[PDB]
Amino acid sequence: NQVELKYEWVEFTLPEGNYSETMTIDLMNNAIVEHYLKVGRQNGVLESDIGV
């Protein structure tokens, strides 16, 4: 009946080039998504409870 939730610090990486403050923010979150599309959806966490 338990529900164990695991969290682990992960260093993200952004591409060289793109400017503009808004565009950088979208990329910071794009990195959060690419992490989920390689570790998240395959283990357990949903698209709803996405941290950060």
Binding site: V33, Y36, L37, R41, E47
Partner: peptide, 13 residues
């Protein structure tokens, strides 16, 4: 249908 794999990207419509 498979059952477990949501590309997570509104491809539709």
């Amino acid at each position: 249908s498979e059952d477990t794999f949501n590309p997570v990207y509104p491809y539709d419509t």
